[PDB]
Amino acid sequence: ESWRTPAIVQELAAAGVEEPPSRYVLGEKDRSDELVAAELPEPIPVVDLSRLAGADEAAKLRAALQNWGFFLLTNHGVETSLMDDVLNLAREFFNQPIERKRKFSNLIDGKNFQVEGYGTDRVVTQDQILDWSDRLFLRVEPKEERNLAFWPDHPESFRDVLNEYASRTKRIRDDIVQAMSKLLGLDEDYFFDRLNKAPALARFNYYPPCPRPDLVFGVRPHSDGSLFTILLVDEDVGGLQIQRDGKWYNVQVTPNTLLINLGDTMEVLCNGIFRSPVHRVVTNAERERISLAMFYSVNDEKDIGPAAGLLDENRPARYRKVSVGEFRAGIIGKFSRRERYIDSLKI
Amino acid sequence: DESWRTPAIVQELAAAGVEEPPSRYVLGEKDRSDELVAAELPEPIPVVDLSRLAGADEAAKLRAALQNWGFFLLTNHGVETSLMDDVLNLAREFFNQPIERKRKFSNLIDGKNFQVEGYGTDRVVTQDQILDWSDRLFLRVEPKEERNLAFWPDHPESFRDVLNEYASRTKRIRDDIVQAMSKLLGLDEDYFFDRLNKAPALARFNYYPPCPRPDLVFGVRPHSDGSLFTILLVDEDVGGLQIQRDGKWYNVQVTPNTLLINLGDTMEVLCNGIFRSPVHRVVTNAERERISLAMFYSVNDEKDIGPAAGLLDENRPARYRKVSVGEFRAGIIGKFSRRERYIDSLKI
Numbered sequence A: 001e002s003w004r005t006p007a008i009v010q011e012l013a014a015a016g017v018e019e020p021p022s023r024y025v026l027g028e029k030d031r032s033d034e035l036v037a038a039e040l041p042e043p044i045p046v047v048d049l050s051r052l053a054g055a056d057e058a059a060k061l062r063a064a065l066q067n068w069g070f071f072l073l074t075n076h077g078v079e080t081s082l083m084d085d086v087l088n089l090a091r092e093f094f095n096q097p098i099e100r101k102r103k104f105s106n107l108i109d110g111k112n113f114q115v116e117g118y119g120t121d122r123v124v125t126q127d128q129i130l131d132w133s134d135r136l137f138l139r140v141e142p143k144e145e146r147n148l149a150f151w152p153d154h155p156e157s158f159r160d161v162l163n164e165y166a167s168r169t170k171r172i173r174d175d176i177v178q179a180m181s182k183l184l185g186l187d188e189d190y191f192f193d194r195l196n197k198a199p200a201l202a203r204f205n206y207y208p209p210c211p212r213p214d215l216v217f218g219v220r221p222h223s224d225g226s227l228f229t230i231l232l233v234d235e236d237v238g239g240l241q242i243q244r245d246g247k248w249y250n251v252q253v254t255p256n257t258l259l260i261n262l263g264d265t266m267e268v269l270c271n272g273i274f275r276s277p278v279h280r281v282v283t284n285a286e287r288e289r290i291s292l293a294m295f296y297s298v299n300d301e302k303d304i305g306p307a308a309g310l311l312d313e314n315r316p317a318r319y320r321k322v323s324v325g326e327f328r329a330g331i332i333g334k335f336s337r338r339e340r341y342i343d344s345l346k347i
Numbered sequence B: 001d002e003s004w005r006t007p008a009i010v011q012e013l014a015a016a017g018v019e020e021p022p023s024r025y026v027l028g029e030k031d032r033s034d035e036l037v038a039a040e041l042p043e044p045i046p047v048v049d050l051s052r053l054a055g056a057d058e059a060a061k062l063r064a065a066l067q068n069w070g071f072f073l074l075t076n077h078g079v080e081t082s083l084m085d086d087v088l089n090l091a092r093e094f095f096n097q098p099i100e101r102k103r104k105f106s107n108l109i110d111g112k113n114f115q116v117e118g119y120g121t122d123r124v125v126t127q128d129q130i131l132d133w134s135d136r137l138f139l140r141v142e143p144k145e146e147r148n149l150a151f152w153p154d155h156p157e158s159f160r161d162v163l164n165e166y167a168s169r170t171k172r173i174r175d176d177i178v179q180a181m182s183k184l185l186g187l188d189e190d191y192f193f194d195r196l197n198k199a200p201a202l203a204r205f206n207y208y209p210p211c212p213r214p215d216l217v218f219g220v221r222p223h224s225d226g227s228l229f230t231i232l233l234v235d236e237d238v239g240g241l242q243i244q245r246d247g248k249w250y251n252v253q254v255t256p257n258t259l260l261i262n263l264g265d266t267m268e269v270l271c272n273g274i275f276r277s278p279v280h281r282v283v284t285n286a287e288r289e290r291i292s293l294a295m296f297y298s299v300n301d302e303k304d305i306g307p308a309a310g311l312l313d314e315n316r317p318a319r320y321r322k323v324s325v326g327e328f329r330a331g332i333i334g335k336f337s338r339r340e341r342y343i344d345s346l347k348i
Ligand SMILES: O=C(O)CCC(=O)C(=O)O
Pocket: A203, A205, A219, A224, A231, A233, A240, A279, A280, A281, A291, A293
């Protein structure tokens, strides 16, 4: 539409067009020698969850979070069948006649936008540049505010499998949070008063093949606004890239393994001892890419600011203190305008 | 100096022979008031015969122990006398080694980086944290995927075989106790067993050295266990374990070759406070050391920890909040460091 109903990017790829529409083509500064990325100069940071209680593993986590802000997780205890099934739901739901899929459109009545549903993100302005990907955004926790009406019916086990996956990742959320609290010198339960009744958001990404991968981004360069994200990818074959010291690095998520990356809230909360990585996804011209991201956010208990226990007067606050509503307003708000909120809070 | 993150081996401090504990072990005046001399049990220690726990007589003895005390002694427990002696010999022979042979298995990795598993004490979070007058060797025996054999000691040479054998006996005990208590609650005997597969089992060998000022320190601070159940074995108890009931402190001597079972905080939550997990502590003495082994049995991450649905109705509301297993565990461990009781933050 004009800008009220952006078209589903999967239908633009199935049109067999050789060029993308003008609303998807980036600028010259964003299309400079960046999309041709390198690969990590060292073995990709890998944390073994089943051994994270040991100080050896906790030091591997520390180096991952200090150097890169993300890592791959192994021996995480999520069954291979469950990871295959939850990704089969996205595979099955996305690979559907579109009349079936439009029933869960995040543009209710075709004109009013919301975050929860199937489609793309918010289009504030007509000249805004749109990503070459579709999404299915679902709030999974707390279960009391779960909007099942937008949860797809096909396959007929979507709610059960996604709920099962949500309860598996909970243990991963708890273990990693406990580990980092010890790494930061805080109480190992420090972060759990901020997680009671906290939002858990599931994002099903469909990056369709693009005839011109040089002109578009699967998702724009960005850092997550969560505490951290668990990422699950279906036979990655590439596309995800992460930035470190200006340079984009190609990161491939090995099948049956999970990628954990930090969000902007964690960087502020830990005063920037670990940082939230800025990342993006590149499209390819042959095959599509489906990923499931689980965002774990903080409740409205306390304001988002550096932890009291990480600040003496010789380690002052590098970041401001803002409310939860102000924080979330800007991660979403600055995502559309292609800026990074957390820079504005840095002192 | 930040050397306070590298806590001393208390057994070494005790061998210094000086007249006072260092100030970091000294309790506040409130903790040292008219408690440390406890009272004697007004009734005999509750005792349960495991071999007859399927019978009404013993199971009723089990209920009275759980409702009134939260703990009981277990007889005919299936653990041979030689095996209890063997597992306590591990503790005796390991601790009575030169500090250089024990330090290989320190939980302070590279001398700096704390982890739970190993020989030392519990996490030192702040400089002003009061420390306990004891060392412990903490070994993760289950699940085997999380087992780290490199911290299981090389002395005596039977350590892995003996502890494995003992733990398999105490696991059986755990199953029997869970079943029996399930029937007490009117639940199916297997109601909780979906929480017991690939669940943590932790062995804690405690070493309480003598202290020149037993009036000033705790061998271990007042606490309830975070487990479902705890099975405790003490080497010739001589004395020191104290348990609290309704604000009063009582001495409890774990008779040799018997096992003390106490209910843990996880069970208290799961049974909605029908039975409660008892607060207990160890006081030191000036003459001799005390050795005990505690097997903590926890739950997996199948469900969040909360009151069992079979125990709730309109006139039986839930008395505890529901929290995830990892959140529960980190709260147990964190609150222990701060001298606070985690389960009270879950009470509704
Ligand atoms: O699809 C990926 O690999 C990245 C997903 C991502 O960054 C997101 O959903 O926020």
